[PDB]
């Protein structure tokens, strides 16, 4: 049910993202889309680690650059329209009552949670967020995360050169 | 003199002591068990599921009186 | 002092893990018996429901088998949507939404 | 699934929100009182009896004054910053270590870092929508210091998580059953005090929201209820930093009354450094956040990497 | 997580209701030309800064770097010890060498 | 004891003239004060010791702070012990008033006296300098002890002759005590 | 010299580098102590782990007393 609520909220924020043109308003629409995307990717998974990782990296880490650039880009304020708010509310109530009149068992995702797994599954009882993150720090896939940290340092070296400081 | 700060501080000590202690009363009222069941490990959630399967109150005990005589 | 405290915490969690390993096989056998019984009633419900759809037999997708290159009497566990089929949404969210609610 | 868990979680969260808000009001009273006693002068008095309903005198006044706006035409973006600020300050408290179960936050440090990473967002919409160059300068300065010590705070708490072996906040209790972490982490205690006075704008890190170099950084156009919500959100952040100091370093001790006495004492310490220290500069604060604290963070994280490897062989 | 959505929506609803009642309780006077003006001290009245932008970029690079330091507390009891130590020492040592090199240059 | 960068002369004192010490004991002392916040600990201790001090708040208006018998407050017009007004309309106070607040208009009275028909002091213009009581040959105009005379309205601070005479009638005891205890200094 | 200048200007970084060198030394000490014994065969397994006597892993189990 709440997965369908997040579907409806993402649809509504995407169509208002298509409608609006003010750059900080699109930045605000992105920062409120990232929360719903984080929660909706939290519904399929065993545990909410990667939603937290996407949260710190994308919203609190990266989009603040977008919010700063779009804040200094536009001198003017938002022109709030009650027509777009009314249309968003109408399509939101329509999509929630459409989720009310729809069977939620067929519309639920087939991806297993931590409790949707079998009871006799030995690997699920060990430690939360342990076996999924294991391949980051084991042979031979540790070279990718070493290359990722090197890639981030090289990215900073690129950014200092292209902005010319 | 300097003991007039303690009107403004000890009240801070009381109010923030409220949201646990009242629950330590309140879980003893409607549940009967003072602590709600910890949902950190998956085995605790499975055994809580087993209790709520066995009885409609998961904090109600199924002791040795449930076992039939044989 | 932190080493002594970590040793105490380690022996406490090893005690809890050993108690979990004691409790586990009885619950595994109980789940085994209920899983086999529920598979029998699910097969019976699918057999009685599909008595009018042409070209349908129980266990295969319209005649074509689901799993090949397997022994003829093997068993694979059905998926959570197919096992919790023939049931309301409240039984699906009864099990699937225990971690998500608390 | 048993419904009294939902009912008691709702009741406990609303009781936590109410008690946090009244403790915010009495924390403003405590700060005005003992901050006076930092100097020779007395604190609030003469209102009600012995100055006790002075924050209610603040609340009646701030909820009655004219809600002025930085421009006359469109000012709905002016509204959304104190709403989200008070929402985050009352929402961050859900990761408090409760021994009786309220929310089973197995990743509480990540939740705290998320709410701190929104602190930059509410102060950025505070700065931009107030239509003034002082407001934009204060918002940019606050975003600068808060993202400058966000990385440092993440590394310091990441070094602390190596001690308990997991991200569960209640695991701070079991590793503090014999001694507090103030003994083992005293330079980390001083660094964490410098961190917690930087994310929340206090006097040692006050170039963002001071009354000297700017008249006010991002509260310059906020008044008549918006300033009240912003003030309550900032003092709730002070209360959260006092609690989070008292969980990590001092023993969690959630039930004991000595834990809340120590929480009031760390709030007293926050008001004690409010009256003592002067204010850092932009260049010296970029020097502090990215070189000294970052180097100490990575170095003593290496120290706990070696120590947790050394104890893993011995245990 | 479903209880967290309910309590966060309740905090948002309570704060919006409190602010709406504060806007009703606020004393409504005649709106003015000068009262709506942005405040500059006294007499009535910024470009892009690259240094703050590279401060945000350094914050972003170190934030994505911290997001790879985050998992290894859990993995320490469930991985190869030599590989984990080599990756952790190499990770923080290359971070420290890069920080000191960017300090010196 | 650090050496002097600049040789200090006899009649002067030099600040920040000490050389920076280079022996290892002083370097370790400065290093520990930098790392462990020792000077900040001394500042915190000095700050915390003032909580235990006596507050100097004098609790207005039940307890009022010290004044002096020479204190300059509300201007007032005195009277003789027989009851005749002291002000002989001699106009040295208006001639000496630097803000020119005093306006005097004088006519001969019925018995032949010189006493005023108009004596106005603009207390919004008066700077409370006390030149009028020094320039008064009789002790007519005087600086009263009163300073709690804040007004709601701008016109109420325009003091007439009747307001000054009422101030002289009201405040006569303290003004006479101050003039008895202060006349030999002047 | 050079270490006196670093101890004069930047003493916290010198102390942190001493702590990091000590942590690297005791990390190598912990790795050598872990691999000196049979650290790959942990005493307390997770889950329910059983071996029959025909398995080669059943001959490598630890019969040490609980510490
Ligand atoms: C039974 C039926 C009875 C009749 C019902 C009739 C319904 C239709 C007619 C009303 C209507 O929609 O008018 C459109 C009319 C036109 O609005 P708009 O120009 O489309 O956009 C609003 C402006 O941008 C707003 O510009 P602004 O910045 O001047 O707005 C001032 C702001 C002032 O806001 C407040 O005072 C709210 C205080 C804070 C609330 C909590 C945070 C949000 O007012 C609002 O936000 C209104 C809500 O909107 C309203 O009248 C809004 C209230 C409804
Ligand atoms: C739900 C609220 C939707 C508000 C909205 O879309 O407002 C329209 C305005 C649109 O701003 P705009 O200036 O880009 O408007 C162009 C779009 N038309 C002309 C069709 C309205 O968006 C905002 O004000 C954003 C507010 C923050 C949203 C998060
Ligand atoms: C609905 C709630 C209505 C009552 C709200 C509380 C008002 C309390 C109040 O104003 O008390 C101060 C005022 C008096 O305080 P005051 O602030 O006017 O003066 C302090 C006194 N001096 C200046 C001499 C130091 O109380 C009253 O006027 C009578 C209060 C009766 C009890 C009211 C409820 C108290 C709880
Ligand atoms: C902890 C948070 C507490 C928040 C609330 C704190 C205060 C609570 C107690 C005091 C309530 C005061 C209510 C009125 C506030 C506005 C006063 C005002 O100017 O009203 C003028 C208005 C209109 O009067 P008017 O005709 O003079 O207004 C015309 C406009 N001017 C001012 C420019 C001339 O009065 C009312 O609308 C009367 C309201 C009566 C009911 C009051 C509320 C009762 C429930 C509480
Ligand atoms: C507006 C949003 C403000 C910022 C909220 C940040 C919350 C942390 C990010 C996140 O994904 O948290 C996962 C968390 C779930 O954390 P979790 O899954 O690790 O915790 C387990 C859940 N309990 C504690 C109940 C056992 O979800 C939320 O915080 C929901 C946020 C809802 C926001 C509603 C308004 C939009
Ligand atoms: C109950 C307690 C009562 C007393 C305390 C009450 C208050 C509670 C605590 C408050 C603390 C203060 C908070 C605000 C701080 C404001 C000042 C500030 O930020 O200063 C920054 C300053 C800035 O450094 P600085 O002083 O070098 O920089 C200024 C000088 N210039 C710019 C010229 C270079 O200090 C630091 O950042 C120091 C680093 C962190 C602390 C030291 C950690 C080092 C590693 C551990 C020890 C290593 C081993 C040593 C032994 C072996 C050696 C080989
Ligand atoms: S100097 Fe004295 S006596 Fe002369 S006119 Fe002035 S108040 Fe009257
Ligand atoms: S005190 Fe000075 S300013 Fe006032 S009336 Fe006397 S001479 Fe004029």
In whole angstroms, what is the distance from residue C21 CA to residue C17 CA? Answer: 6
Residues whose CB is less than 8 angstroms from the CB of residue A65 and which lie 6 or more positions away in sequence, other chains included: E53, E56, E57, E60
Could you tell me the distance, in angstroms and rounded to a whole number, from the CA of residue F77 to the centre of ligand 8?
Answer: 13
Method: cryo-EM
Encoded tokens for B66: 């449930």
> What secondary structure does DSSP assign to A16-70, as a single string?
HHHH---HHHHHHHHHHHHHHHHHHHHHHSSSTHHHHHHIIIIIIIIHHHHHHHH
F126 labelled as ligand-binding?
yes
Contacts with G20 from chain D: Cβ below 8 Å: 298-300, 302-303
Within chain C, where are the H helices? 2-49, 80-83, 89-96
Q: Write the residue in D303, D310, D313 that is nearest to G20 by C-beta.
A: D303
Per the CB < 8 A criterion, the answer to whether D220 and D138 are in contact is yes
F166 labelled as ligand-binding?
no
Q: How far is CA F76 from CA F101, F165, F175, in A?
A: 14, 7, 9
Encoded tokens for G57: 């892993």
CATH number of E1-105: 1.20.58.1610
Q: Does B49 sit within 8 Å of C95, measured CB to CB?
A: yes
Per the CB < 8 A criterion, the answer to whether D141 and D217 are in contact is yes
The residue among B28, B30, B33, B35 whose CA lies nearest residue B60 is: B33
Q: Whose CA is nearest to atom 6 of ligand 8?
A: F132
Residues whose CB is less than 8 angstroms from the CB of residue D223 and which lie 6 or more positions away in sequence, other chains included: D62, D65, D67, D68
- Residue E41, SS3 per DSSP: coil
> What secondary structure does DSSP assign to F94-141, as a single string?
HHH-TT--EEEEE---TTS---EEEEEEETTT-----HHHHS-SSS-E
Encoded tokens for D67: 């809600």
With touching defined as 3+ CB pairs under 8 A, do chains E and C touch?
A: yes
F93 labelled as ligand-binding?
yes
In whole angstroms, what is the distance from residue D102 CA to residue B20 CA? Answer: 10
Residues of chain D contacting G, Cβ within 8 Å: 292, 295-296, 298-300, 302-307, 309-314
Point out the ligand nearest to the CA of residue F130.
8
Q: Whose CA is nearest to atom 30 of ligand 1?
A: D74
Q: Which of A115, A116, A120, A131 to mutate to test the interface with B (most CBs of B within 10 A)?
A: A115
Closest residue in A to B43 (Cα–Cα): A125
Q: Write the residue in F43, F51, F57 that is nearest to D34 by C-beta.
A: F51
In whole angstroms, what is the distance from residue F161 CA to residue F163 CA? Answer: 5
In whole angstroms, what is the distance from residue A115 CA to residue C97 CA? Answer: 8
Boundaries of every domain in chain E? 1-105
The residue among F155, D10, D244, D207 whose CA lies nearest residue B19 is: D10
Q: Whose CA is nearest to atom 20 of ligand 4?
A: E27
Residues whose CB is less than 8 angstroms from the CB of residue F43 and which lie 6 or more positions away in sequence, other chains included: D276, D277
Per the CB < 8 A criterion, the answer to whether D28 and D58 are in contact is yes
Contacts with G34 from chain E: Cβ below 8 Å: 81
F132 labelled as ligand-binding?
yes
Residues whose CB is less than 8 angstroms from the CB of residue F115 and which lie 6 or more positions away in sequence, other chains included: F84, F85, F87, F88, F89, F106, F109
Q: Does D267 sit within 8 Å of B12, measured CB to CB?
A: yes
With touching defined as 3+ CB pairs under 8 A, do chains E and F touch?
A: no
């Amino acid at each position: 049910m709440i997965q369908l609520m997040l579907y409806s909220l993402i649809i509504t924020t995407s169509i208002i993202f298509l409608n609006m043109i003010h750059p900080l308003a699109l930045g605000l629409t992105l920062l409120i889309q990232t929360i719903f995307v984080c929660l909706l990717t939290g519904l399929m998974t065993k545990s909410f680690w990667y939603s937290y990782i996407l949260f710190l990296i994308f919203l609190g880490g990266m989009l603040v650059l977008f919010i700063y650039v779009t804040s200094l880009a536009s001198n003017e304020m938002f022109n709030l329209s009650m027509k777009l708010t009314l249309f968003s509310s109408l399509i939101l109530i329509f999509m929630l009552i459409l989720s009310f009149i729809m069977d939620k068992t067929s519309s639920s995702l087939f991806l297993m949670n931590n409790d949707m797994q079998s009871i006799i599954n030995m690997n699920s009882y060990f430690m939360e967020n342990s076996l999924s993150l294991n391949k980051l720090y084991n042979f031979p896939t540790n070279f990718i995360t070493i290359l990722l940290m090197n890639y981030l340092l090289i990215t900073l070296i690129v950014i200092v050169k292209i902005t010319k400081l | 003199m300097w003991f007039e700060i303690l009107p403004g501080a000890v009240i801070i000590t009381t109010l923030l002591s409220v949201p646990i202690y009242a629950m330590y009363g309140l879980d003893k009222l409607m549940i009967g068990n003072a602590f709600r069941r910890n949902m950190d490990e998956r085995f605790s959630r499975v055994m809580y599921q087993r209790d709520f399967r066995l009885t409609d109150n998961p904090y109600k005990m199924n002791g040795l009186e449930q076992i039939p005589d044989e | 002092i932190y080493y002594l405290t970590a040793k105490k915490v380690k022996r406490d969690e090893i005690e809890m893990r050993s108690a979990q390993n004691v409790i586990f096989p009885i619950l595994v056998a109980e789940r085994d018996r209920e899983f086999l019984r529920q598979l029998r009633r699910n097969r019976d419900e699918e057999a009685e429901l599909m008595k009018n759809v042409p070209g349908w037999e129980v266990g295969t997708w319209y005649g074509e088998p689901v799993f090949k290159t397997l022994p003829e009497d093997t068993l694979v566990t059905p998926i959570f949507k197919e096992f919790y089929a023939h049931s309301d949404w409240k039984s699906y969210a009864k099990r699937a939404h225990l971690k998500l609610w608390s | 699934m048993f419904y009294m868990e939902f009912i008691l979680s709702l009741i406990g969260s609303l009781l936590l929100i109410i008690c946090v808000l009244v403790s915010v009001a009495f924390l403003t009273l405590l700060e005005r009182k003992v901050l006076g006693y930092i100097q020779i002068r007395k604190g609030p008095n003469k209102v009600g009896l012995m100055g006790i309903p002075q924050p209610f005198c603040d609340a009646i006044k701030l909820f009655t004054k004219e809600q002025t706006y930085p421009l006359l035409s469109n000012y709905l973006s002016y509204y959304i910053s104190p709403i989200f600020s008070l929402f985050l300050s009352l929402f961050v408290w859900m990761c408090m270590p409760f021994f009786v179960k309220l929310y089973s936050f197995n990743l509480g440090g990540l939740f705290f870092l998320c709410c701190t990473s929104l602190g930059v967002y509410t102060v950025m919409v505070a700065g931009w929508s107030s239509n003034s160059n002082y407001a934009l300068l204060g918002g940019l300065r606050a975003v600068a210091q808060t993202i400058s010590y966000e990385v440092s705070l993440a590394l310091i708490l990441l070094s602390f998580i190596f001690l308990i072996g997991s991200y569960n906040m209640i695991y701070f209790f079991f590793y503090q059953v014999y001694m507090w972490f103030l003994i083992i982490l005293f330079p980390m205690a001083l660094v964490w005090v410098s961190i917690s006075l930087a994310e929340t704008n206090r006097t040692p890190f006050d170039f963002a929201e001071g009354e000297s170099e700017l008249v006010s950084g991002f509260n310059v156009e906020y008044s008549s209820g918006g300033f009240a919500l912003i003030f309550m959100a900032e003092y709730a952040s002070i209360l959260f930093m006092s609690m989070l100091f008292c969980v990590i370093f001092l023993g969690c001790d959630v039930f004991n009354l000595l834990f809340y006495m120590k929480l009031t004492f760390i709030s007293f310490v926050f008001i004690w450094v409010r009256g003592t220290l002067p204010r850092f500069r932009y260049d010296k604060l970029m020097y502090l956040a990215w070189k000294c604290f970052l180097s100490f963070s990575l170095n003593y994280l290496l120290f706990f990497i070696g120590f947790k490897i050394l104890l893993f062989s011995l245990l | 997580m479903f209880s967290i959505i309910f309590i966060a929506l309740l905090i948002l609803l309570i704060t919006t209701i409190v602010m709406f009642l504060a806007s009703i309780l606020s004393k409504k006077a005649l709106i003015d030309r000068e009262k709506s003006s942005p405040f500059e001290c006294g007499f009535d009245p910024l470009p892009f800064s690259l240094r703050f932008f590279l401060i945000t970029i350094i914050f972003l690079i170190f934030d994505v770097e911290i997001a790879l330091i985050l998992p290894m507390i859990i993995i320490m009891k469930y991985s190869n010890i030599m590989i984990w130590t080599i990756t952790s020492i190499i990770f923080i040592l290359i971070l420290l060498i890069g920080l000191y090199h960017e300090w010196n240059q | 004891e650090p050496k002097d960068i600049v040789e200090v002369p006899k009649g002067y004192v030099y600040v920040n003239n000490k050389e920076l010490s280079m022996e290892f004991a002083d370097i370790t002392d400065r290093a520990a004060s930098t790392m462990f916040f020792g000077e900040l600990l001394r500042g915190f201790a000095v700050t915390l010791a003032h909580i235990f001090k006596e507050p100097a708040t004098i609790n207005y208006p039940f307890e009022k702070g010290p004044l002096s018998p020479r204190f300059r407050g509300e201007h007032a017009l005195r009277r003789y012990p027989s009851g005749e007004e002291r002000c002989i309309a001699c106009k040295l106070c208006e001639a000496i008033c630097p803000a020119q607040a005093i306006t005097i208009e004088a006519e001969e009275r019925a018995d032949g006296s010189r006493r005023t028909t108009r004596y106005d002091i603009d207390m919004t213009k008066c700077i409370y300098c006390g030149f009028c009581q020094e320039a008064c040959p009789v002790d007519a105009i005087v600086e009263g002890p009163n300073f709690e005379f804040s007004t709601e309205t701008h016109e109420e601070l325009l003091y007439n002759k009747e307001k000054l005479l009422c101030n002289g009638d009201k405040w006569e005891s303290e003004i006479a005590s101050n003039l008895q205890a202060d006349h030999l200094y002047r | 010299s050079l270490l006196k200048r670093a101890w004069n200007e930047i003493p916290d970084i010198v102390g942190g580098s001493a702590l990091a060198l000590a942590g690297i030394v005791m990390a190598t000490i912990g790795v050598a102590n872990y691999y000196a014994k049979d650290g790959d065969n942990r005493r307390y397994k997770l889950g329910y782990v059983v071996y029959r006597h025909d398995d080669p892993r059943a001959l490598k189990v630890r019969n040490d007393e609980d510490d």
